[PDB]
Design a binder for these strands. Structure first.
Lengths: 138, 12, 21, 431, 22
RNA sequence: CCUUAAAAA
RNA sequence: GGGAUUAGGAAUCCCCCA
RNA sequence: UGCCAGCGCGGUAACGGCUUAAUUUGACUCAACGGUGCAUAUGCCACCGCGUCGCUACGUAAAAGUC
RNA sequence: UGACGUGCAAAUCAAUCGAACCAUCGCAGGAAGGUGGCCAUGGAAGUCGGAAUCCGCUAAGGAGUGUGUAACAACUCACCUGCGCAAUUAGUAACUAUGACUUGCCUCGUCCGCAUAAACCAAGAAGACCCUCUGGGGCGGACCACAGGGAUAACUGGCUUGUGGCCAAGCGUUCAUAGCGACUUUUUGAUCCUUCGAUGUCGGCUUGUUCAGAACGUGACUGGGUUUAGAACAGGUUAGUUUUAACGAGAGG
């Protein structure tokens, strides 16, 4: 019934929402748990880290954890070896080129909000996102 | 200055 | 020709009391 | 230099593991060797203790004491000269692992110097004397003015230390003088003036260093009147002038005068701790005065405030019965963490969730005060400790539960899932 | 009648005063 | 030249 | 600092005029 | 409960040694070189003798102090 | 420290002695998308810090110059379009400190003793002080007498201002300049120019004190500190002639 505009507040690489998100979120009116539970494992087990944004639509007086990434940090996703980094490890400069298929095969989800020319624009704009690589596709 | 007394010549 | 007269003063010093006619 | 602080945390872990340790009988042997004192004399007195231990009305206890003595003796031999910040030795034969008993020795060089002796071969380690070292005590630089130079000493709980000392010629009384003794008074005022200058500037070289305080003392101490013209002069100090404690008369003068200045500085230190307490709590009273609500108290909202942006001034009393015991199932089917108020400690209802009825098992003790100590820097702001000794402090305890803090800004009570997530996911943003 | 002077007097006293505090 | 505070009528 | 004597330590014995 | 809390009692029946994951352990003049010989096949778990100065308390008491 | 103080008086109410006397030698409109960039940070998403500073659209827009917010939000600027002639009196006790033991410099000490008619034409006065290779002398390298010197100090004043006094890294929760801020002679030194046949030197009108501008205001007032002889000293204590013509939550107000 009740619905409201999203706030997309997350900014963490952590699993299961906050360190203990399951309990504080409850209110006096009460609410029914959904995506906050096991569904996070679908995200943590596949799209871990990279501070993915989460829309809060609340379609039925309850939390709704959308799992879709925006951009920017997405360029980092193209790597096969992310076994944490703990803390204070010299900012861990993890980088090593990128797959040649960085084009529409990865950018297909990015098309929803970009506008302008396709091949002259949206496919080209992702190239500037890869400042973190420091080596380019070459 | 001659020394003496009585006479007025003294002190001259 | 004023008349000459003497008078005693401090520390035994003598000073004139001459008349002026 | 943060790694040295990590070493300090290691020293704290050593103090915890040390104090936790205990041993039956008088066999246990604590020891503390003072700075600037020969080790060999301590070896002689320890030998006298070995002679005292030569006759004991017990079997195993005799061999245990003598063995601890041989242990501290063999351990002592590695040193050749007295270590910096003194020496602190512990020895014994503690029992662990379901009554298993083993000999143990503990050595470390403290980050913070201490100047006291403490030999006491009785049960349980006497680490309380080291607890004063655990605090981040400020250096207490003390200036001891005199008519024949001045003594730039310091204090550090117990460790007195004279950073500098000197003597200078004094113009003194004009004496029989002459028709113009006043010019002699002018040269007197001039030498006194230079004494106000180059000496205090040398103090600027030896204390403030570089726009950062190294001392909280700067206590005056002089049999002569110079201290009265010291605090009352433009040439004195910037900012540091407010750090002055109280005048300290010295009947003998000199280093002995610095020695009386020690304990007198201790009582006036109690005084300025009183002002510091009344101020640190009084600013919180000023926060109470505002209708803006930029304040927090109790175990309730304050924790959620810690979850978000750090409180501008955390304020927590020492003793606190509440403990942060973890609520983690052995099957890990439901992680949980919550504060344990004493009524809940009696009820213990929270251990048994209605969802399954399983009771969470304890893993390791996690006291709330140490829980503040574990990573207060990570939480932002700075940790603070308040005593109940102040009259305002008792009001802080009985009137607020002994815990609270100054918020950077006002916070509303949570309500509905939207605002509740607006606060909680924001807490995640601050984490 | 003629002798002169010669004596400490009152005037001699200042001279005494001036040499007093050099 | 002296002798445990580290434990019995 | 390491031995020896003593039940064990000291000790002794082995290395400017205003 | 185990000189702690309490009422004369209460102190678990009121080769040496560093090192080492271990260097098993007992044994200190002659009379050393699983826990408890200070409960006794077994229970319980007496010469090695007897004022000054510095701390605390109201000359004395209270300490293991230094001569 | 009275009166007098060129007086009644060379001391009042052999006149000379630390070697006598005599003689001789602008306004309106656009200021935005990928993207809240990366990283650090409790948070800082133009405007805390670090690095980087690339482009789609387009008549404009920076990985943002200056305000603001905890941070956003918001308001603007770079750019863009339109309009009678005496006489001054080494090492150390089991908390620490300490240490058995092995007339006072500092000094205004607090509640193991540095060192027990006339004068005169400012006056009377050839300074009883200072001084007779040396930026005065001494050092380094005062019971006193006389002849002279501002050629050579101390009082003041003059010259000098070394001394003293009166751009903006940062502080100020945030923010450089609300308020602070690193890198003139009222002080003194120095000079000896003026004054040695004389310019009466201090303070005042609990410590004598200054302290806590006007010859270092004012002696043709005080003698307290200095202070010649009594008991060599910027070592102390004592007694010693001073002359003449509404607002704010409240508390507060």
């Amino acid at each position: 019934p009740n619905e409201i505009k999203v706030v997309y507040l997350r900014c963490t690489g952590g699993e299961v929402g906050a360190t203990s998100a399951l309990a504080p979120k409850i209110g006096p009116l009460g609410l029914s748990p959904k995506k906050v539970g096991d569904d996070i494992a679908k995200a943590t087990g596949d799209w871990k880290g990279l501070r993915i944004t989460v829309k809060l639509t609340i379609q039925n007086r309850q939390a709704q954890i959308e799992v879709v990434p925006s951009a920017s940090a997405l360029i980092i996703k193209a790597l096969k070896e992310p076994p944490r980094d703990r803390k204070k490890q010299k900012n861990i400069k993890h980088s090593g080129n990128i797959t040649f298929d960085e084009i529409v095969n990865i950018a297909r989800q990015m098309r929803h909000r970009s506008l302008a020319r396709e091949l002259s624009g949206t496919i080209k704009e992702i190239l500037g996102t890869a400042q973190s690589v420091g080596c380019n596709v070459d | 200055r001659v020394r003496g007394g009585g006479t007025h010549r003294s002190g001259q | 020709p004023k008349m000459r007269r003497r008078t005693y003063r401090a520390h035994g010093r003598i000073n004139p009391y001459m008349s002026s006619p | 230099a943060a790694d040295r602080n990590v070493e300090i945390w290691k020293i704290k872990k050593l103090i915890k593991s040390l104090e936790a340790a205990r041993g039956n009988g008088t066999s246990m042997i604590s020891l503390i060797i003072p700075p600037k004192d020969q080790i060999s004399r301590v070896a002689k007195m320890l030998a006298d203790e070995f002679g005292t231990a030569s006759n004991i009305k017990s079997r195993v206890n005799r061999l245990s004491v003598l063995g601890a003595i041989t242990s501290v003796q063999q351990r002592l031999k590695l040193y050749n000269k007295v270590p910096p910040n003194g020496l602190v030795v512990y020895c014994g034969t503690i029992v662990t692992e379901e009554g298993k008993e083993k000999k143990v020795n503990i050595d470390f060089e403290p980050f913070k110097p201490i100047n006291t002796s403490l030999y006491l071969c009785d049960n349980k380690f006497h680490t309380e004397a080291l607890t004063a070292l655990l605090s981040d005590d400020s250096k207490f630089g003390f200036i001891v003015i005199d008519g024949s130079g001045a003594l730039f000493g310091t204090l550090q709980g117990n460790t007195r230390e004279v950073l500098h000392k000197f003597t200078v010629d004094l113009p003194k009384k004009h004496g029989r003088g002459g028709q113009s003794a006043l010019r002699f008074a002018r040269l007197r005022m001039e030498k006194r003036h230079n004494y106000v200058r180059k000496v205090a500037e040398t103090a600027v070289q030896l204390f403030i260093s570089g726009d950062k305080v190294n001392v909280a003392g700067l206590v005056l101490a002089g049999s002569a009147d110079f201290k009265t013209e010291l605090s009352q002069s433009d040439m004195f100090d910037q900012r540091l002038q407010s750090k002055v404690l109280k005048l300290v008369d010295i009947s003998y003068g000199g280093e002995n005068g610095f020695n009386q200045a020690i304990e007198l500085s201790t009582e006036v230190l109690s005084n300025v701790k009183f002002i510091q307490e009344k101020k640190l709590i009084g600013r919180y009273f000023d926060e109470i005065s505002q209708d803006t609500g930029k304040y927090c108290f109790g175990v309730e909202d304050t924790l959620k405030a810690l979850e978000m942006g750090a409180v501008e001034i955390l304020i927590v009393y020492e003793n606190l019965d509440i403990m942060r015991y973890v609520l983690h199932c052995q099957g890990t089917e439901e992680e949980k963490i919550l504060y344990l108020t004493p009524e809940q400690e009696k009820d213990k209802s929270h251990f048994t969730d209605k969802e399954t009825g399983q009771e969470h098992e304890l893993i390791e003790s996690m006291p709330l005060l140490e829980w503040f100590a574990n990573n207060y820097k990570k939480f932002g702001a700075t940790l603070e400790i308040v005593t109940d000794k102040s009259q305002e402090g008792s009001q802080f305890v009985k009137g607020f539960g002994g815990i609270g803090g100054i918020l950077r800004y006002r916070v509303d009570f949570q309500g509905m899932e939207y605002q509740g997530g607006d606060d909680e996911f924001f807490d995640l943003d601050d984490y | 009648m003629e002798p002169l002077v010669l004596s400490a007097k009152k005037l001699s006293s200042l001279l005494t005063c001036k040499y007093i505090p050099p």
